[model samples]
Target: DELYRQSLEIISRYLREQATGAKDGRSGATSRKALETLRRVGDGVQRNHETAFQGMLRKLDIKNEDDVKSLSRVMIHVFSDGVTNWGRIVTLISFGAFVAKHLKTINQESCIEPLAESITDVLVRTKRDWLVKQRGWDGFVEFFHV
Candidate 1:
């Protein structure tokens, strides 16, 4: 659909613009890093383009600014998780792709927010929990001298 195509174009432009723009310290670094992670995902999608359409073509309807924002937010969360919990980030991405694959959609736009929200939730919350668990375990082992 033209709407969906336009929406993607807008988002791609937004990410590219943000990637090149000036910024202040941490905020600029965060923006550039998030943009980098998202660009990596976009590249993966392109490399898997034929495969993406072969099975059920997942409708990620990027229909408006909100939808684009939703995707960007998810990307940032995933990037942050990768930095803080490198061990679990791979699992999070795998689980996210699995969940996205099975999700039901009414239309393209209706699904974008739901999918991105769900993936972000898994990546952020679950990975944070795992990191805490691992830290506790490490502390226990060191304290026990075993």
Candidate 2:
């Protein structure tokens, strides 16, 4: 937990520096803290992997930790890429389907609709809300042009 906290601090400091466009800057203290944190987290992850690997080895009657580690690392790299790549598109489609599947309930209870209707509602409502919030009636009128 301490290591995780330190790692988070490093990431926060890095993001802050980036947002400020602070070139030639160093959050060395945070970075160093995070390096130690990284080691701790890495150890925890390795331990967990070892436990899982042992189970797999027992199942297969194999006893090579190095091979397990190597295979795990490589497979994780590949699986991570495959699952996360284009994740946004998958998420959008899933959300649409979810909304569509529950449209009747949504419309009756949550003021929502099927995927197509929900999408149109979102677009229309967003435009209407933004206009009302930012520019009153004139902004609402501009939506026709949009």
Candidate 3:
């Protein structure tokens, strides 16, 4: 829980900076690389990974801060009901940035912490095994990072 708690902070901070167009150059290196890596239709991703992500966001339809609770369900739907691979996990959190940007535009930036809480909650409860297997997000940093 400690490490994941730290991970959640990174996620939340990234959401804050990402929403404001702040560059994640140093402090957020780990999550930032992971997010940028997943956002593109890159070599690691399956064909339509981006499509699936966009579809998930469209279906989630988080129009307000009040909708972040439902928006959080994306992890459950994409993980339990479907696959639970690192790619999807990475995509899910990375997409948080997208959702955060939406929240920013809609003046719901306050929802960012709730968004991180929900993401970390579901991720730990449902995917702790896989996360530990990968050695937390450091392994993710190793995956696409130098």
Report lDDT (CA) for all predictions: 0.40, 0.33, 0.68
Model 2 Cα lDDT, one tens digit per residue, 1-146: 33323323443332223233342224455455433343344334435555554454345332233322333333333333532222221222223323222333223212221223333232233334442363432232232222
TM-score: the better of candidates 1 and 3: 3
lDDT of 3 at 73: 55
RMSD of each: 13.3, 23.1, 4.2
- The sequence of per-residue lDDT tens digits that candidate 3 reaches over residues 43-122 is 23424465765676678778886688776555677557667676666566667777787788888888888887887777
Error of 1 at 41 (Å): 4.5
The runs of at least 3 residues in candidate 2 whose Cα sits more than 4 Å from the true structure, single-residue gaps closed, are: 1-26, 51-146
Q: What is candidate 2's CA lDDT for residue 16?
A: 29
Q: Estimate each model's TM-score.
A: 0.35, 0.23, 0.73
Model 3, residue 72: what's the lDDT? 55
Candidate No. with top TM-score: 3
Of candidate 3, the 10-residue stretch with the lowest lDDT total is: 39-48
Q: How far off is residue 94 in model 3, in Å?
A: 1.8
